[PDB]
């Protein structure tokens, strides 16, 4: 006669939840299990702000769902509340949810456009210029890897550091200006994903 409160029977409660960032809207990612002595018809539930934006709860079968995009790069750990409700109390219990990374981020360059001036006389060996490509996914995926594209016979860039070096004597009257495309890659071994940067080499010649 005098309700008892229901309790949720979930272990994850005692572990945690990984859902994966690209995971897309609308996918159940768990359901809700809660016990009541009573047997009383449930409701279930998610509290909080945040995990109201990102969390929405089936009230009568507790199945969660996913409301907003996971991102990894923004946000990697959820604390969540859920709620259930015998209708005669709301009880809570927090889970820890942990967003799973994926290569989801092609390289981003930074400070372009990308131009450099420089003297013909500028000898093989010489750096000119540094190419600057970001990628926030982890792991080989966050790791980043410059080339030219199509390759120059004029210039080289390094893999790992993007120092863009002449290895040919330059001649201005043959080329007065290049215009190489940069290709900054990740190193995700199986779905590698990569951006394009111009980069403007233009010769001067100050003694005609
Ligand atoms: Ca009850
Ligand atoms: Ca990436
Ligand atoms: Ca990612
Ligand atoms: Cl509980
Ligand atoms: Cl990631
Ligand atoms: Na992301």
Excluded: C
């Excluded at 969390?55 to 923004?74: C, H, I």
């Excluded at 390094?158 to 990740?186: K, P």
């Amino acid at each position: 006669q005098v309700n008892r409160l229901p309790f949720f029977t979930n272990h994850f409660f005692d572990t945690y939840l990984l859902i994966s960032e690209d995971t897309p809207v609308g996918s159940s990612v768990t359901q809700l299990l809660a016990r009541d002595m009573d047997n009383d018809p449930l409701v279930f539930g998610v509290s909080g702000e945040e995990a109201s934006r990102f969390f929405a709860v089936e009230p009568d079968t507790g199945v969660v769902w996913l409301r907003q995009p996971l991102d990894r790069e923004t946000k990697s750990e959820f604390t969540v509340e859920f709620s259930v409700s015998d209708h005669q109390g709301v009880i809570t219990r927090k889970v820890n949810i942990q967003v799973g990374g994926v290569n989801d981020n092609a390289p981003t360059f930074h400070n372009q456009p990308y131009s450099v001036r420089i003297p013909e006389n500028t000898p093989v060996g010489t750096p000119i210029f540094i190419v600057n490509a970001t990628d926030p996914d982890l792991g080989a995926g966050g790791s980043v890897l410059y080339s030219f594209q199509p390759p120059s016979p004029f210039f080289a860039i390094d893999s790992a550091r993007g120092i863009v070096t002449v290895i040919q004597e330059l001649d201005y009257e043959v080329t007065q200006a290049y215009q190489l495309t940069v290709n900054a890659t990740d190193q995700d071994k199986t779905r590698p994903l990569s951006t394009l940067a111009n980069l403007a080499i233009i010769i001067t010649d100050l003694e005609h």
